[model samples]
Target: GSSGSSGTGEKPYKCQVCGKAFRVSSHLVQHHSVHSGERPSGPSSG
Candidate 1:
């Protein structure tokens, strides 16, 4: 667990649209895409 935004039980960042809490800052960013109509980023298996 860290500070400002980190850990398993102490989530700091929250989604403004859905009010969903996330432990990591990046998780919050990824959740934002859902509201921005953006696709998830990552490699896909073929």
Candidate 2:
């Protein structure tokens, strides 16, 4: 039997560098800015 546990939109994961909380694990990985910050700056190049 499972105990009554209702979950809400509460994100507990916080970044030590930026102090940003994420609800999903995937978001934490994508939030990493260790690599180059280049984002097709030239006319929105891909």
Candidate 3:
């Protein structure tokens, strides 16, 4: 890990709604699509 948002490779989420960084795989999974599409519209739309 690094800091507020840290990794050794690439950043995977850019919150078009809030402009923040994610620090976990699951977080990216929940957030990445919001930048480009609608909510998951299924069992994973937390």
Best of the candidates, TM-score: 1
Across 1-46, the per-residue lDDT of candidate 1 in tens digits comes to 2344644475667766667777689877877777677456548542
lDDT of 2 by residue, 1-46 (tens): 1112533555766567555667677887787663337565557746
In the predicted model 3, the residue pairs found to clash are: none
For model 2, the local distance difference test gives 0.58
For model 3, residues 1-46, the per-residue Cα lDDT tens digits are 2335455555665454556567466886676666576546558747
User: Least lDDT summed over 10 consecutive residues: which range in candidate 3?
Assistant: 1-10
Cα displacement (angstroms), candidate 2, residue 19, comes to: 0.2
Better of 1 and 3 by TM-score: 1
Rank order by TM-score, top first? 1, 2, 3
Q: Against the true structure, what is every candidate's RMSD?
A: 7.6, 10.3, 8.7
Instruction: Evaluate all candidate structures by whole-model CA lDDT and list the values in order.
Output: 0.66, 0.58, 0.59
Candidate 2, superposed: residue stretches over 4 Å from native:
1-10, 34-46
What does the lDDT read for residue 44 in candidate 1? 50
lDDT of 3: 0.59
> Model 3 — TM-score against the truth?
0.30
| Pairs with steric clashes in candidate 2 | none
